[PDB]
Amino acid sequence: GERLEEAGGATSAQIELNKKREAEMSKLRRDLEESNIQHESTLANLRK
Amino acid sequence: GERLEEAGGATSAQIELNKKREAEMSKLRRDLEESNIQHESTLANLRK
């Protein structure tokens, strides 16, 4: 009975972190755009 | 006793998935710098 709770814990435990890691992927996906759209501004700035 | 192997079959499936998931997570994490050092060099090469 404890063995279900720990292994069913183990299906619950790792499923939170990779889901949280999936939030980390979508975090850096914004930074790649942020390192583009902010970065394209200075090239538009420095040509002026 | 039926729940024991499916909780084992879930973890043996899911922990199989994360070792390539951390790789593609590492890929975008290893992507931001060669946008950064690229966009710094085009700040550099356009400067002189």
Side-chain angles (χ1 to χ4, degrees):
Chain A
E2 175 60 12
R3 196 168 193 167
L4 183 139
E5 196 272 351
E6 177 272 349
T11 59
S12 79
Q14 273 83 4
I15 210 166
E16 207 284 335
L17 58 89
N18 48 10
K19 185 253 180 180
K20 189 179 175 66
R21 212 67 46 92
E22 277 302 331
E24 291 289 17
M25 180 262 277
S26 54
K27 172 176 179 297
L28 304 180
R29 277 252 160 81
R30 258 186 180 269
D31 302 284
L32 165 72
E33 263 155 20
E34 173 61 8
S35 66
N36 186 27
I37 191 68
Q38 191 281 337
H39 273 227
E40 176 60 14
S41 71
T42 58
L43 194 144
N45 178 84
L46 214 64
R47 60 97 175 173
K48 162 174 176 183
Chain B
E2 177 273 348
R3 267 88 167 273
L4 169 63
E5 281 82 6
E6 56 89 13
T11 44
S12 62
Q14 180 154 324
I15 304 305
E16 191 41 65
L17 169 140
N18 304 280
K19 73 198 74 183
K20 41 188 171 292
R21 169 65 37 165
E22 202 80 19
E24 54 207 341
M25 203 303 299
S26 73
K27 175 66 57 174
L28 279 86
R29 193 177 259 273
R30 212 199 46 107
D31 272 315
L32 280 197
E33 56 275 58
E34 66 262 48
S35 48
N36 193 269
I37 70 182
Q38 156 80 14
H39 205 87
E40 185 262 356
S41 45
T42 45
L43 188 138
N45 183 36
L46 202 40
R47 202 159 188 200
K48 67 176 156 56

